[PDB]
């Protein structure tokens, strides 16, 4: 989330056992980091 010039990141690693699709289980993401960057954001792209 980019709010008020801060980029929030929340995250959760989780051990799974499937070949495809999202699991069914509920689990809440915790605050990872929070960055005071000030920039506007409208698009993004993944790095591989």
């Amino acid at each position: 989330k980019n709010i008020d010039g801060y980029f929030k990141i929340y995250s959760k690693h989780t051990p799974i056992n499937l070949v495809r699709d999202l699991p069914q289980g509920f689990s809440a993401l915790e605050p990872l980091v929070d960055l005071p960057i000030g920039i506007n954001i409208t698009r993004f792209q993944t790095l591989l």
């Binding site: 008020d4 010039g5 801060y6 005071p36 960057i37 000030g38």
Partner: protein, 48 residues
């Protein structure tokens, strides 16, 4: 040539120069505020 001079001069920093011709190192600290959140701040005191 005449009317056509190289634009830079070099200082004659002899050790026996009068004080007006001694070298001085200078630093200029320029502060600024934008709409980005503040990131440089003075230290905060704690009581016991």
């Amino acid at each position: 040539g005449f009317n056509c001079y190289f634009p830079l001069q070099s200082y004659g920093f002899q050790p026996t120069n009068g004080v007006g011709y001694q070298p001085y190192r200078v630093v200029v600290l320029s502060f600024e505020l934008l709409h980005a959140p503040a990131t440089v701040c003075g230290p905060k005191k704690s009581t016991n």
